[PDB]
Amino acid sequence: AIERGSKVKILRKESYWYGDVGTVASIDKSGIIYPVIVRFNKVNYNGFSGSAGGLNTNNFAEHELEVVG
């Protein structure tokens, strides 16, 4: 099961960090299809201005992540 701070290999085809692993940051209450936000320490600036957006976290479903810890 997706534990906390566990190593999860992202298995999302259309993902900026697909094929890479990430550190589980926190899970949601199943409010959305991708409540699990993983950490990648990677930024994808593609339109920033004024307020510093920045992501560093991608949403992913439980079945979309592969706990390989």
From Swiss-Prot:
The keyword Membrane is assigned to this record: yes
Keywords from the named record: Membrane, Photosynthesis, Photosystem I, Thylakoid
Domain of life of the source: Bacteria
A GO term from the CC aspect: plasma membrane-derived thylakoid membrane
Alphabetized InterPro entries for the sequence: Elect_transpt_acc-like_dom_sf (IPR008990), PSI_PsaE (IPR003375)
Entry's Gene Ontology BP terms: photosynthesis
Protein's recorded name: Photosystem I reaction center subunit IV
Source organism of the structure: Picosynechococcus sp. (strain ATCC 27264 / PCC 7002 / PR-6) (Agmenellum quadruplicatum)
Lineage, top ranks: Bacteria, Bacillati, Cyanobacteriota, Cyanophyceae, Oscillatoriophycideae
